[PDB]
Amino acid sequence: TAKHRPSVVWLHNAECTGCTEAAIRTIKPYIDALILDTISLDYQETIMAAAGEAAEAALHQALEGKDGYYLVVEGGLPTIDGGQWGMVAGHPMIETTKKAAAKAKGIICIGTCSAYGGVQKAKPNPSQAKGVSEALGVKTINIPGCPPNPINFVGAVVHVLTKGIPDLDENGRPKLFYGELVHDNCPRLPHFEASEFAPSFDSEEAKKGFCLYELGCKGPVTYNNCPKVLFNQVNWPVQAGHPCLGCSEPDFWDTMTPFYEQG
Amino acid sequence: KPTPQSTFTGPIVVDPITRIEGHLRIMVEVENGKVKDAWSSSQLFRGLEIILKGRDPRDAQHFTQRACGVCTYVHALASSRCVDDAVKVSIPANARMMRNLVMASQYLHDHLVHFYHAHALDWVDVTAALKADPNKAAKLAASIAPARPGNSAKALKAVQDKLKAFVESGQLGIFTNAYFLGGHKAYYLPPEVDLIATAHYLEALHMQVKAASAMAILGGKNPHTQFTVVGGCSNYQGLTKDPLANYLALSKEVCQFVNECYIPDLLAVAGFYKDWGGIGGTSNYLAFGEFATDDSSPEKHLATSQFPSGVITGRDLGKVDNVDLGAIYEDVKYSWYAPGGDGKHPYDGVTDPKYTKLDDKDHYSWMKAPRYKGKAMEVGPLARTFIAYAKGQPDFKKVVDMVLGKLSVPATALHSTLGRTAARGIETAIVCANMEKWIKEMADSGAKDNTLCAKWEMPEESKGVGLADAPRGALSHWIRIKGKKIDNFQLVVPSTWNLGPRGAQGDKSPVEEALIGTPIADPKRPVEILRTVHAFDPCIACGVH
Ligand SMILES: *S(=O)(=O)N1CCOCC1
Ligand code: SF4
Ligand code: SF4
Ligand code: FCO
Ligand code: F3S
Ligand SMILES: [Mg+2]
Ligand code: NI
Numbered sequence: 040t041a042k043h044r045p046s047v048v049w050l051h052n053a054e055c056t057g058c059t060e061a062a063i064r065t066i067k068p069y070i071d072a073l074i075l076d077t078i079s080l081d082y083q084e085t086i087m088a089a090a091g092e093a094a095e096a097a098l099h100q101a102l103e104g105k106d107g108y109y110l111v112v113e114g115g116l117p118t119i120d121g122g123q124w125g126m127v128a129g130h131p132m133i134e135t136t137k138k139a140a141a142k143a144k145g146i147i148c149i150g151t152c153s154a155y156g157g158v159q160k161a162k163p164n165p166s167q168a169k170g171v172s173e174a175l176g177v178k179t180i181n182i183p184g185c186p187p188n189p190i191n192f193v194g195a196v197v198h199v200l201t202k203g204i205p206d207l208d209e210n211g212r213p214k215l216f217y218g219e220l221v222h223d224n225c226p227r228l229p230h231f232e233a234s235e236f237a238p239s240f241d242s243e244e245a246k247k248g249f250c251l252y253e254l255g256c257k258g259p260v261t262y263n264n265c266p267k268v269l270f271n272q273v274n275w276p277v278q279a280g281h282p283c284l285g286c287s288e289p290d291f292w293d294t295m296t297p298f299y300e301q302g
Numbered sequence: 303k304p305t306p307q308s309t310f311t312g313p314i315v316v317d318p319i320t321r322i323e324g325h326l327r328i329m330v331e332v333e334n335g336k337v338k339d340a341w342s343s344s345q346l347f348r349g350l351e352i353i354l355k356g357r358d359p360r361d362a363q364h365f366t367q368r369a370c371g372v373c374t375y376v377h378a379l380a381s382s383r384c385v386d387d388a389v390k391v392s393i394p395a396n397a398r399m400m401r402n403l404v405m406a407s408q409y410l411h412d413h414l415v416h417f418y419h420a421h422a423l424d425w426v427d428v429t430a431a432l433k434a435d436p437n438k439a440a441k442l443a444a445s446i447a448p449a450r451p452g453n454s455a456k457a458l459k460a461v462q463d464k465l466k467a468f469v470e471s472g473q474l475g476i477f478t479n480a481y482f483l484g485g486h487k488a489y490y491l492p493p494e495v496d497l498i499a500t501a502h503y504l505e506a507l508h509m510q511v512k513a514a515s516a517m518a519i520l521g522g523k524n525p526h527t528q529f530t531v532v533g534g535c536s537n538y539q540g541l542t543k544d545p546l547a548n549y550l551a552l553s554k555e556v557c558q559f560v561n562e563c564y565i566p567d568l569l570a571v572a573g574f575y576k577d578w579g580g581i582g583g584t585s586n587y588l589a590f591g592e593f594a595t596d597d598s599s600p601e602k603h604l605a606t607s608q609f610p611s612g613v614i615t616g617r618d619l620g621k622v623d624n625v626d627l628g629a630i631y632e633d634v635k636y637s638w639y640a641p642g643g644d645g646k647h648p649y650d651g652v653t654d655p656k657y658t659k660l661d662d663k664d665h666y667s668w669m670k671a672p673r674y675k676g677k678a679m680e681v682g683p684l685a686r687t688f689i690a691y692a693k694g695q696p697d698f699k700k701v702v703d704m705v706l707g708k709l710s711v712p713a714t715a716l717h718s719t720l721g722r723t724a725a726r727g728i729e730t731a732i733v734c735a736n737m738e739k740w741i742k743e744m745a746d747s748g749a750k751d752n753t754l755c756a757k758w759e760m761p762e763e764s765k766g767v768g769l770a771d772a773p774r775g776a777l778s779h780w781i782r783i784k785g786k787k788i789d790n791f792q793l794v795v796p797s798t799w800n801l802g803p804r805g806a807q808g809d810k811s812p813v814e815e816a817l818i819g820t821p822i823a824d825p826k827r828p829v830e831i832l833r834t835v836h837a838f839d840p841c842i843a844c845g846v847h
């Protein structure tokens with residue numbers, strides 16, 4: 040029988056691989072089910088068997104597939120010195136991503152790095168790292184966070200494949216996952232409203248679970264679904280007593296720092 | 303029984319190295335089917351040390367954690383230890399315990415995924431699993447591992463059926479162009495062993511979710527934990543009964559998988575590839591230790607780590623030297639940095655990027671070359687294992703000797719690619735053996751004491767060092783504070799030690815040395831290069847930062 044699952048090409052540029060790691064924490068479905076039954080994951084450096092020229096050949100085979108493909112991009116694009124500070128198989132990352140982007144059916148940026156530029160773009164930006172849209176002038180479906188929840192990434196992938204492009208906000212993020220502030224769903228919200236704050240991490244107020252706003256919490260300015268869905272089915276930063284860093288916001292390394300202050 | 307080896311003479315370049323973290327190009331020169339020279343060429347620079355300059359030292363751990371998301375947590379921990387040392391705060395006992403448990407959880411997650419998802423495909427012909435008799439496979443599994451339902455013929459057949467449907471679909475996905483397709487002489491396993499391993503590969507994808515959930519009970523989330531602060535930790539809930547009960551339960555499930563699947567599979571594979579106990583050796587080993595009972599200073603960390611610190615040189619297991627933090631430096635001679643940067647202790651570190659061209663053998667990597675008293679050092683599970691074994695650490699003596707007896711090899715056989723692989727499993731088993739003790743310690747401490755963060759003040763000017771032995775080895779972060787801001791922040795990371803380029807004297811790094819003598823059965827499908835490179839568990843985002 041002639042069969043085809045939609046082709047996904049996943050590129051790793053200037054990244055930490057935490058977005059790949061987040062993706063494999065999916066439980067609805069688990070990653071095996073996703074790649075056996077739902078998608079055809081045709082290039083993915085972290086887990087693929089082929090290496091070297093065999094891997095490059097697998098990429099080219101996917102990019103030239105007659106059925107077309109969806110492009111997942113992990114990491115920012117280092118542009119200084121002709122793209123040479125980030126290379127795979129002897130080619131600048133910006134060149135390969137540009138080529139893949141030009142024929143993709145759709146482009147999903149997994150993480151704040153591919154969406155907006157991320158950690159390597161932070162001042163003074165040694166590599167002149169850029170987000171994908173920033174560098175290429177193409178529209179992307181952004182699944183930011185550092186890393187995003189698998190629920191948001193796998194949810195977006197499944198949406199794209201079954202429903203179409205989900206409604207996106209002005210930062211390119213699906214409203215399904217990114218439509219609400221972290222703070223609006225935070226269980227410490229009643230403390231915030233009552234101006235009940237922890238003044239320090241060692242304070243009795245911190246022990247009591249008071250709001251972390253005075254310790255820098257960026258939940259009030261950060262769009263994400265963290266308190267609602269949790270991470271790893273067990274926790275999220277504020278539940279572990281630590282302020283939100285703002286990690287799903289563009290350029291947060293520069294706009295949300297100092298992290299323990301309200302700048 | 304001879305190890306397969308072609309007559310190939312010529313260059314081989316493997317770029318990308320897949321099934322690692324980050325972007326690595328390996329070049330080798332081969333003569334008569336054996337590697338005679340090697341280069342480890344890291345292909346991405348981000349520049350986190352540069353980015354940190356002028357920033358709030360409290361922010362460092364958040365930036366440096368993003369050196370890598372495979373070894374998530376460990377850089378947050380090293381930066382937190384580093385800033386705690388620079389501000390001269392001693393974290394509370396509960397924070398030492400919690401930080402060390404999160405490290406233990408990380409070891410379990412990381413090593414399980416490495417063995418199955420990164421390394422196994424170099425040893426296991428997945429397509430050959432379709433040829434196995436699942437009853438014979440079940441009988442074999444019953445002889446080599448504890449009884450378990452996932453090793454039943456019915457379960458193994460269900461795996462075979464899933465794999466058969468996938469292969470016959472025409473879309474091989476992550477197996478496209480795999481080196482084992484069509485048969486490969488360097489792949490030795492019986493089909494039944496391939497099937498058992500493949501079944502466990504799939505189970506491990508589910509088990510690693512549980513390992514990460516355990517870690518997140520204490521860490522807040524995985525990847526990229528968010529529970530450490532200057533002076534300790536923030537997660538008061540993690541000291542309490544129900545969360546720790548769930549942490550124990552999940553950790554016990556993960557450890558059951560380590561003991562039932564990872565170790566037996568590792569030993570089965572090792573048994574068929576005993577020739578790889580003579581390939582891929584190096585001679586010098588370094589560890590900062592981990593799992594210390596006193597983390598009030600870097601010196602106390604070195605002295606009280608339950609996985610001990612030390613230095614071994616020249617394969618001499620009869621002597622382990624103390625680590626002298628003053629003797630660490632990094633070279634840039636063969637790296638993509640400005641001339642003039644050789645010989646820098648990390649408190650004097652310089653990060654001045656200067657690219658030349660691809661394959662310039664004078665400047666071929668974005669990694670620096672860390673050296674110790676003039677020598678390259680291998681770091682990681684094998685280093686820890688040799689240091690602990692040499693010192694008579696009782697858990698390492700027991701588990702190492704178990705492996706030596708099962709394989710009928712001496713401790714010297716561990717100076718090898720097979721040994722490096724084995725050590726990773728040995729230490730995973732040891733971490734598992736200690737989880738209940740460590741969890742009980744923290745549960746009893748947290749029940750009687752809820753001090754989790756110490757008071758501290760930012761000094762105008764200071765310096766500090768944070769040490770950890772991360773899953774891949776000896777990690778150190780080094781800060782100079784001036785004007786209450788970061789004046790210099792240098793990371794020296796385990797993959798920097800292992801997979802950096804040559805040092806100032808032209809001396810090969812551990813991976814470069816280890817690659818000398820590698821046999822190549824098929825130069826178009828050089829799986830042997832991958833076996834050794836993967837055994838070091840490379841992380842190029844870590845190594846370069
Ligand atoms: S803060 O700036 O006080 N803050 C509070 C409410 O919403 C966003 C920011
Ligand atoms: S978004 Fe964060 S977790 Fe993902 S690649 Fe970038 S630094 Fe890593
Ligand atoms: S802890 Fe953060 S997200 Fe929660 S109520 Fe306070 S400011 Fe809002
Ligand atoms: N383990 C790990 Fe990552 C590397 N190399 C760090 O530190
Ligand atoms: S730091 Fe990021 S993971 Fe959620 S809690 Fe804040 S948006
Ligand atoms: Mg460094
Ligand atoms: Ni890493």
Ligand SMILES: [S]
Nearest residue numbers: 043046104106
């Ligand atoms: S396809």
